[PDB]
Design an enzyme around this catalytic site. Structure first.
Site, mmCIF file in Angstrom:
data_model
loop_
_atom_site.group_PDB
_atom_site.id
_atom_site.type_symbol
_atom_site.label_atom_id
_atom_site.label_comp_id
_atom_site.label_asym_id
_atom_site.label_seq_id
_atom_site.Cartn_x
_atom_site.Cartn_y
_atom_site.Cartn_z
ATOM 1 N N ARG B 15 42.463 8.097 -12.126
ATOM 2 C CA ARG B 15 42.828 9.129 -13.097
ATOM 3 C C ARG B 15 43.547 10.350 -12.514
ATOM 4 O O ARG B 15 43.703 11.370 -13.183
ATOM 5 C CB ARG B 15 41.606 9.552 -13.926
ATOM 6 C CG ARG B 15 41.202 8.526 -14.975
ATOM 7 C CD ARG B 15 39.708 8.258 -14.839
ATOM 8 N NE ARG B 15 38.883 9.488 -14.941
ATOM 9 C CZ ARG B 15 37.571 9.518 -14.685
ATOM 10 N NH1 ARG B 15 36.975 8.396 -14.303
ATOM 11 N NH2 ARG B 15 36.847 10.650 -14.860
ATOM 12 N N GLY B 101 33.256 13.114 -0.834
ATOM 13 C CA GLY B 101 34.513 13.679 -0.453
ATOM 14 C C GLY B 101 35.191 14.385 -1.586
ATOM 15 O O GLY B 101 36.155 15.073 -1.318
ATOM 16 N N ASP B 102 34.712 14.218 -2.824
ATOM 17 C CA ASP B 102 35.319 14.874 -3.972
ATOM 18 C C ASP B 102 34.426 15.985 -4.573
ATOM 19 O O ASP B 102 34.540 16.332 -5.743
ATOM 20 C CB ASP B 102 35.715 13.820 -5.038
ATOM 21 C CG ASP B 102 34.626 12.768 -5.296
ATOM 22 O OD1 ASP B 102 33.419 13.048 -5.156
ATOM 23 O OD2 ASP B 102 34.986 11.640 -5.680
ATOM 24 N N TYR B 363 71.316 41.157 5.305
ATOM 25 C CA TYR B 363 70.708 40.001 5.946
ATOM 26 C C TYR B 363 70.619 40.216 7.462
ATOM 27 O O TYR B 363 71.639 40.343 8.101
ATOM 28 C CB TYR B 363 71.506 38.710 5.673
ATOM 29 C CG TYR B 363 71.036 37.558 6.543
ATOM 30 C CD1 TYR B 363 69.699 37.139 6.534
ATOM 31 C CD2 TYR B 363 71.890 36.939 7.428
ATOM 32 C CE1 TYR B 363 69.227 36.138 7.385
ATOM 33 C CE2 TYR B 363 71.430 35.927 8.294
ATOM 34 C CZ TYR B 363 70.085 35.529 8.257
ATOM 35 O OH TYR B 363 69.577 34.489 9.035
ATOM 36 N N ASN B 374 70.171 53.168 11.100
ATOM 37 C CA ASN B 374 70.368 53.077 9.674
ATOM 38 C C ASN B 374 71.322 51.926 9.351
ATOM 39 O O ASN B 374 72.449 51.930 9.818
ATOM 40 C CB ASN B 374 70.932 54.399 9.152
ATOM 41 C CG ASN B 374 70.805 54.512 7.648
ATOM 42 O OD1 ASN B 374 71.590 53.902 6.868
ATOM 43 N ND2 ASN B 374 69.795 55.269 7.208
#
Ligand SMILES: CCNC(=O)CCNC(=O)[C@H](O)C(C)(C)COP(=O)(O)OP(=O)(O)OC[C@H]1O[C@@H](n2cnc3c(N)ncnc32)[C@H](O)[C@@H]1OP(=O)(O)O
Ligand SMILES: CCNC(=O)CCNC(=O)[C@H](O)C(C)(C)COP(=O)(O)OP(=O)(O)OC[C@H]1O[C@@H](n2cnc3c(N)ncnc32)[C@H](O)[C@@H]1OP(=O)(O)O
Ligand SMILES: CCNC(=O)CCNC(=O)[C@H](O)C(C)(C)COP(=O)(O)OP(=O)(O)OC[C@H]1O[C@@H](n2cnc3c(N)ncnc32)[C@H](O)[C@@H]1OP(=O)(O)O
Ligand SMILES: CC(=O)N[C@H]1[C@@H](OP(=O)(O)OP(=O)(O)OC[C@H]2O[C@@H](n3ccc(=O)[nH]c3=O)[C@H](O)[C@@H]2O)O[C@H](CO)[C@@H](O)[C@@H]1O
Ligand SMILES: CC(=O)N[C@H]1[C@@H](OP(=O)(O)OP(=O)(O)OC[C@H]2O[C@@H](n3ccc(=O)[nH]c3=O)[C@H](O)[C@@H]2O)O[C@H](CO)[C@@H](O)[C@@H]1O
Ligand SMILES: CC(=O)N[C@H]1[C@@H](OP(=O)(O)OP(=O)(O)OC[C@H]2O[C@@H](n3ccc(=O)[nH]c3=O)[C@H](O)[C@@H]2O)O[C@H](CO)[C@@H](O)[C@@H]1O
Ligand SMILES: CC(=O)N[C@H]1[C@@H](OP(=O)(O)O)O[C@H](CO)[C@@H](O)[C@@H]1O
Ligand SMILES: CC(=O)N[C@H]1[C@@H](OP(=O)(O)O)O[C@H](CO)[C@@H](O)[C@@H]1O
Ligand SMILES: CC(=O)N[C@H]1[C@@H](OP(=O)(O)O)O[C@H](CO)[C@@H](O)[C@@H]1O
Ligand SMILES: [Co+2]
Lengths: 449, 449, 449
Positions: B15, B101-102, B363, B374
């Site tokens: 499921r 495990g779940d 960038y 600056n």
């Protein structure tokens, strides 16, 4: 009728783990104590006495209400002891309402209700029935009449069965308050001065005490740690959202909306999820705000459309403006009718004229741009030489090529045109073409590294 | 005392409709099974036996815990059958704790409680009372003593009335486990090997089984589909937020906060709504994080202010830094004291010195920028020739004009100045002005198309 | 069997405080009334009669369903009066299902259930039992048989005790509907024509009325103000999220997910918090969507990774594409296999070829870019001369230096290279280097202002 309020806040907020006085922690944009003060003035309080213990420096700096009378309480020898410190400033012919500095949601409606129930020469007490009254003062009654309050530590098992507890809020006549306060002794469990003892003192003096209950429990909830603060934050926000919805403002998801200030609005305003309003915000008719937007101290005209993830502060948008997504408007930003600002665009102290468009990757600072002007992407205004900032002026019908940098101070005449990739260091004549381009050349069979 | 853990996870997660083993689906940043393993080691487990059926390749690739002993179970002939596969690796003188495990939320506190109740030579069983025990093993008792477990399919209507069900978690002695496991038969409804049969086997052997209950139901909840996973996700997040609040961290809205890793913090840290923390994050004192921020594997010094919608990964910010809104810091980003990064600014392997400012549309990649520098808007570092990447160095007190592109490798001396719209291909001397500008010209009465 | 539906929506939505007809207020991306119409057609309705009072202009403009027969009701003299207006268009041998234009969550399953229970020559009535039936029509029964409905205003105290109330939804034969409708009088409390009177009229005619109940209360909830609309918005969203989870789609937080349209998907799709899907969206296998993303009318291929805060509209991404964070794709955006778009990058009517990269601060509009092309940061396509827009073409294996502006119309041959800071106004030969650079010069000891 004459009424004054006293706010006690001299207690230590240990479980806050903060270097800031507990009552100063903000809730919906303002300090918790400030919420209490507002309710005080809103109720019509003549004088607001604030009792503090420490951090008074940060307190006086955070709070600046004209009618704020500061009352010191060096030692926290109990709420009663605290009230005695302010007692001297109680007008004999005025009423005195006592409040807690850590109970921010108390409403004016309920406080006004407590005022009316207060019998002449008696006391108005606010009480609530909890499923578990553990740890709170227990209200005792004789033939349905409140005769006093017994603290948890002092109450017997049988008495701890009583579920009607004291919220702390009460109102009485100044002169009466002083007479009782003077008779307070500390012969009890805590070994402190209980302000709650005045209830019995009034009962035995023949005075009658009436009890009034609040609209909601959250109203009289106190904050001792941050988790409780967050809880009341949600209550406040939920109530605010709810009022806005019923007021005609559409919120995509009330659970995902935060108002931290004041919001004026028109009809059919639509706000998407995760939007935050700070300070004073004015929204015209049919204003649309996309998801994740942040608006602070700004004015937005009719039919404006704010795209997703746009940050606005101290800006003014005329009617029919469209900004975003990813737009950042800083203090001084102004947009005239039908102005448009695209994505990755920032404005600081800049005015975009009617129908003007600043579509992409642009920075406009300290500039005045006329109407029908087009700013290509990459355009930048150089308004800082490292020491001073200069203004940029662009007349109407101007077309600015992309990646153009205007070195301020500079002026571009009306109808002028600036070629792409131009550096404007000098004024441009009206209807003229400004340019500073190197002819494109080429080199055959160029291999890259 | 000697203790080992066994995690069964050989069942098929149909499921889930996934091409990934169910137990590998993440919860709060890690695989569900990993949560179970952590609790195992955290409890002090010597060896952690993991029973799997398929997808073992993805499993071994996702899980790499030193004490992880892989146990294969080709066929899922029942939990008992599964336990028999690991049985051979059980130390006779050690205790064996069985886990699913779940069931990711199982807590160490509750597991430690189950250990203590475990009688010598007996079994420690974890059970819970549900409103509707449908579909779960029913706990049967004789004179208050657990004598066994009856599966739903095997239980009679009358027995299905019992609300105390088996969670699956139990602990017993290795030697004892082997003796019972060997006697398991599959003569029951499902026609499988029930690990639950050992409960009766122990009872009839004169051993006693004690039952212990968990703190919360969510603790022993299993995940079979994604909807159940999302539910436990909220529980985990809510508990985490709650701990942070009580720990002194202010969260504007706990319901709108996600922690997927570890978060170290100082005092008075403030986090707005919709913030996500991933990996290991360190927050200094008084750190402010605006709404919608994403921080991963990063360090943030004292008094830093992260504006709305800023993405940070593997970055290091010194004290008093201010970045955003709309800032993107990539691996290798470093900011020194008081550094500032504005909106639409990206940094990758770049260092911004003290008090240096990278305000807009910029960038910075593979660069080292000194202090008091600056960087004007539009500035870009060209660190890639299409094959290799080169470094950019900028000394102190440098002023870089807007829309400047530095072609690496290049060095700009201290106090140097670069005119706006400059292309730097060569080193710039200290206290010198670099430029590559075409004088602005003009053409009168230029009409646009 | 022949069936037609009638939707009443001629009532005034005063408490909406809107200049838009109540039923036109959107819910999950569509008008409330549109939700009702869909359920009508979805059930198999032959004709859908819509009764309106005003705003019919905006209505006809918002709704355009082929089988939409408009029925005017000048005066709102009651639901019965309204039904009489549409009565003339009822086919004698067809069934008539009545619905409200402000009850958007009504499900087809429940409507199909109501159809089956409808006795031949009788009536199918949908009813619900509320804790507080105040203000709703009360269902009266004789020996378990529904004999009629009494409105709240007309019901006596004793009758107001009945908790089974009328939802408004009912179905009967057209011919039968007309016979009863003709006998309606307004001699009651409200002094209006009650459609509810037909229930008694049928009972006394010997016809039998059967009652059916809905799956959920929210199904038959009506919207009179915006707060109620927001509530149903959450129900709708919660149900949708829930279906997606159980369908194999992972949602980090269902409470923080909004679907306003249709979503087709593959396996293992992962969606983070605060994501919004609008219009028709197709998601391939293993698609990852970061937090705060907005996707509208777009197609996303297998293994695509959408980083945080990315806005996409009418775009098409091939397999293995990676865009964002902070990326904005506008109508006409196409990305081929393995294409990459970084932060602060916008695409409008542009195609990025296979493996091509547009990493930062870039604007691509009206362009066709080949495969293995690299677009440096700051690159911009000038596709607008102020009147017309022109196309940009870039062949394969092209390397575009940063801060390059291509003035359209222009073509760059395959394998070509464009130096950083170049202005392309002319076509570039294949394997050639395009450039327009001013040699870098320097000025010693330059002092800034
Ligand atoms: C969508 C955003 N788009 C943009 O930002 C692009 C803006 N457009 C530009 O920059 C265009 O190159 C311009 C507006 C400058 C030219 O318009 P367009 O390309 O249709 O016309 P042309 O290329 O034939 O323009 C040539 C003229 O500009 C001038 N020009 C072109 N290159 C140079 C140069 N390197 N130095 C001086 N003048 C130049 C010439 O004096 C000539 O004038 P003329 O018409 O009397 O001969
Ligand atoms: C807010 C972000 N702002 C920015 O990025 C803007 C940065 N500022 C600039 O680019 C400025 O144009 C500069 C720093 C280059 C000039 O400063 P400012 O405009 O106040 O002074 P001036 O225009 O009189 O500067 C002229 C000097 O630069 C040089 N200059 C100006 N244009 C050119 C050119 N095309 N080629 C060579 N040198 C040039 C000259 O050699 C001259 O030197 P001098 O002072 O000995 O005569
Ligand atoms: C990460 C993003 N990076 C970028 O966008 C940077 C893109 N790279 C560039 O713009 C580079 O400066 C270039 C590709 C143009 C040069 O490559 P690189 O710096 O490794 O080599 P060089 O500086 O020695 O290139 C010189 C050549 O370009 C030409 N060149 C350099 N400056 C100029 C100029 N002002 N005018 C005309 N040609 C020039 C010369 O004709 C010369 O050709 P040659 O090799 O036959 O002598
Ligand atoms: C003795 C007394 O009044 N008892 C009441 C008080 O409990 P209690 O006295 O235990 O409560 P707190 O100590 O929290 O005091 C309430 C408020 O008074 C302030 N403060 C307290 C002591 C002091 O010396 N100075 C000072 O300013 C605190 O900062 C806080 O704002 O509130 C409860 C509800 O919250 C009531 O049910 C108790 O009946
Ligand atoms: C027979 C048994 O033990 N019954 C218990 C089991 O039910 P039940 O056996 O029905 O439960 P499951 O089949 O889900 O098994 C539980 C766990 O065991 C694993 N698994 C199962 C079979 C197998 O051959 N191999 C394997 O590794 C599953 O992957 C899952 O992790 O858990 C319920 C609580 O959840 C208990 O109330 C039941 O009493
Ligand atoms: C008289 C009648 O039918 N009573 C039922 C009606 O109450 P009631 O008639 O009071 O409810 P409303 O007035 O809201 O009418 C329901 C719907 O009919 C529309 N409308 C109403 C009057 C009109 O002249 N034209 C028109 O089109 C409204 O726009 C709304 O879409 O719904 C309730 C549930 O919601 C039921 O419990 C009541 O038994
Ligand atoms: C780089 C550039 O200059 N783009 C132009 C160009 O963008 P579009 O996104 O194609 O609409 O047309 C706009 C007017 O439609 C103009 O305002 C904008 O500046
Ligand atoms: C395009 C540009 O260079 N803008 C400058 C300029 O921006 P403001 O937003 O006006 O503060 O002043 C800053 C210092 O106050 C500097 O760091 C920044 O680079
Ligand atoms: C300004 C610039 O051109 N940056 C380049 C450069 O960015 P990085 O962030 O360093 O990866 O390398 C990329 C390929 O790795 C290229 O696609 C991109 O355009
Ligand atoms: Co440039």
């Amino acid at each position: 009728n004459a009424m004054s309020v006293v706010i006690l806040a001299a207690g230590k907020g240990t479980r806050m783990y903060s270097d800031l006085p507990k009552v100063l922690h903000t809730l919906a944009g303002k300090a918790m104590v400030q919420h209490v003060i507002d309710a005080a003035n809103e109720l019509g309080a003549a004088h607001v006495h604030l009792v503090y213990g420490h951090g008074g420096d940060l307190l006086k700096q955070a709070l600046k209400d004209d009618n704020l009378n500061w009352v010191l309480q060096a030692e926290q020898l109990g709420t009663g002891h605290a009230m005695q410190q302010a007692a001297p400033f109680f007008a004999d012919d005025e009423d005195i309402l006592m409040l807690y500095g850590d109970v921010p949601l108390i409403s004016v409606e309920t406080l006004q209700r407590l005022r009316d129930a207060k019998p002449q020469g008696g006391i108005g007490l606010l009480t609530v029935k909890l499923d578990d009254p553990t740890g709170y003062g227990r209200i005792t009654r004789e033939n349905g009449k409140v005769t006093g309050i017994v603290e948890h530590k002092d109450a017997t098992d049988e008495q701890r069965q009583i579920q009607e507890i004291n919220t702390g809020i009460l109102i009485a006549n100044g002169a009466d308050m002083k007479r009782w306060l003077a008779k307070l002794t500390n012969n009890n469990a805590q070994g402190e001065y209980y302000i709650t003892d005045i209830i019995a003192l009034a009962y035995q003096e023949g005075r009658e005490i009436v009890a009034v209950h609040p609209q909601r429990l959250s109203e009289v909830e106190g904050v001792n740690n941050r988790l409780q603060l967050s809880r009341l934050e949600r209550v406040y926000q939920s109530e605010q959202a709810e009022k806005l919805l019923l007021a005609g403002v559409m919120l995509r998801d009330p659970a995902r909306f935060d108002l931290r200030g004041t919001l004026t609005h028109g009809r059919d305003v639509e706000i998407d999820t995760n939007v935050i309003i700070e300070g004073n915000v004015t929204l015209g008719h049919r204003v649309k705000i996309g998801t994740g937007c942040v608006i602070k101290n700004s004015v937005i005209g009719d039919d404006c459309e704010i795209s997703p993830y746009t940050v606005v502060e101290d800006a003014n948008l005329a009617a029919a403006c469209t900004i975003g997504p990813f737009a950042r408007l800083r203090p001084g930003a102004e947009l005239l009718e039908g102005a448009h600002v695209g994505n990755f665009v920032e404005m600081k102290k800049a005015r975009l004229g009617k129908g003007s468009k600043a579509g992409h990757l642009t920075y406009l600072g300290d500039a005045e741009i006329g109407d029908n002007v087009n700013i290509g992407a990459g355009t930048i205004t150089c308004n800082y030489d490292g020491a001073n900032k200069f203004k940029t002026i662009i007349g109407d019908d101007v077309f600015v090529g992309s990646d153009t940098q205007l070195v301020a101070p500079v002026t571009v005449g009306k109808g002028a045109t600036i070629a792409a990739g131009t550096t404007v260091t000098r004024n441009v004549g009206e209807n003229a073409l400004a340019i500073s381009r190197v002819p494109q050349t080429q080199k055959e069979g160029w291999r890259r590294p």
